Amino acid sequence: APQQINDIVHRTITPLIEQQKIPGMAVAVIYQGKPYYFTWGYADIAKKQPVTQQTLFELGSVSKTFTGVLGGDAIARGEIKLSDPTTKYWPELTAKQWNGITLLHLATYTAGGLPLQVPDEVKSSSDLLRFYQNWQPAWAPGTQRLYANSSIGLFGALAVKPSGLSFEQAMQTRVFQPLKLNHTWINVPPAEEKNYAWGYREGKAVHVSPGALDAEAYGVKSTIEDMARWVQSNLKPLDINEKTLQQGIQLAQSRYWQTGDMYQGLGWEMLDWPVNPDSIINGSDNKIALAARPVKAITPPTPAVRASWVHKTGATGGFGSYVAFIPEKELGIVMLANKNYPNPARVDAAWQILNALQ
Numbered sequence: 001a002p003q004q005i006n007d008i009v010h011r012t013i014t015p016l017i018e019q020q021k022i023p024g025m026a027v028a029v030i031y032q033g034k035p036y037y038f039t040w041g042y043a044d045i046a047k048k049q050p051v052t053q054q055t056l057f058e059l060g061s062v063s064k065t066f067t068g069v070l071g072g073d074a075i076a077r078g079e080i081k082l083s084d085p086t087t088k089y090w091p092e093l094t095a096k097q098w099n100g101i102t103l104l105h106l107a108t109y110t111a112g113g114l115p116l117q118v119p120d121e122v123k124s125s126s127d128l129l130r131f132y133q134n135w136q137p138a139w140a141p142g143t144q145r146l147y148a149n150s151s152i153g154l155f156g157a158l159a160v161k162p163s164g165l166s167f168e169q170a171m172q173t174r175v176f177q178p179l180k181l182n183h184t185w186i187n188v189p190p191a192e193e194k195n196y197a198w199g200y201r202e203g204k205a206v207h208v209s210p211g212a213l214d215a216e217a218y219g220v221k222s223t224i225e226d227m228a229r230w231v232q233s234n235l236k237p238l239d240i241n242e243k244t245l246q247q248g249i250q251l252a253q254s255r256y257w258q259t260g261d262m263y264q265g266l267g268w269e270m271l272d273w274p275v276n277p278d279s280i281i282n283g284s285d286n287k288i289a290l291a292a293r294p295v296k297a298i299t300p301p302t303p304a305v306r307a308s309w310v311h312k313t314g315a316t317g318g319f320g321s322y323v324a325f326i327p328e329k330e331l332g333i334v335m336l337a338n339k340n341y342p343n344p345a346r347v348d349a350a351w352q353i354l355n356a357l358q
């Protein structure tokens, strides 16, 4: 890598790892469109297995960017429209509170207060129907954004129904395979388990536990190389030869709602570039990111703006991930760690690196 990249990465990430007690970390810096890889520490402490470019990390809610792009691809195929009612895809959802809730609302957390988590008691198809049939909205649809797995998770499950594929098969066939993300998994196969890092929480080695709609909301695992390729693909969608996927990437970066200086895409979140770094850093704290806030609709949605900071945080019990990129500058970063450490620390480090390189 160029010396300027090596320098800023050492001076930013090694102290972050020191400050936050991160056991293992992988970073890709995309500079002039090309990834440069860095690793530190251990994927498995007790085995003394190092983080490598093949180590799988849990992406947590960075998975929602895959779900958003898969939904965009379905839009580009004509399989769904965001204005469609939820009940078009799930007719058994006969409870009246669902009248007026569209796929757009599910995808963008604006259905009116669907909860952050699907309850752990939901273990069967009938349990899930019962949960949504009995959910009572706090607000009218299209007025308040409340970040929620039960919202975008249901969006992803319904968006694949016209294809006839399971969510996993749709994601594999329509996103992972065309982009050559050959080490990205919803379910890690037995022969790849040797590369699956442990997450660390309060000194204990942990992996994400199964839950309803986990694949759609938080269940993807990937390597630093595949995640760099994901960033490259979202930086430069015209490089993608599959037109529906090129367009799905673009649609996931369209601006559907605004709250303050933040815009909601499909999975991705965006701000105008140049960005006020304090807004992305502070806005990433869960006290804010998880709070309900009023949204203003953007109709028609703004087509993807290349002068944007586009990003997403992710967490599981044992992992913390962050992706950010700036299409206009051909500049991005992926930070994968096997500890869930505070979001503002992630965003600050990402800002420091990308700001030094623009």
Ligand SMILES: NCCN[C@H]1CC[C@H](CC2=N[C@H]3Cc4cccc(C(=O)O)c4O[B@@-]3(O)O2)CC1
Pocket: 096, 097, 099, 100, 112, 137, 138, 139, 140, 141
């Ligand atoms: N399709 C809904 C028909 N109206 C019904 C109107 C009463 C409402 C009770 C309620 N629950 C909260 C969430 C909510 C949802 C939709 C509309 C509103 C509204 O105030 O208009 C709304 O406001 B709330 O404070 O009022 C139940 C629905």
Ligand SMILES: [Cl-]
Pocket: 010, 011
């Ligand atoms: Cl130094």
Ligand SMILES: [Cl-]
Pocket: 168, 172, 184, 185, 186, 187, 188
């Ligand atoms: Cl998979």
Ligand SMILES: [Cl-]
Pocket: 207, 208, 209, 316, 317, 318
């Ligand atoms: Cl977890």
Ligand code: NA
Pocket: 210, 211, 213, 214, 215, 219
């Ligand atoms: Na699952």
Ligand SMILES: [Zn+2]
Pocket: 010, 011, 014
């Ligand atoms: Zn140093």
Ligand SMILES: [Zn+2]
Pocket: 014, 015, 018
């Ligand atoms: Zn050190």
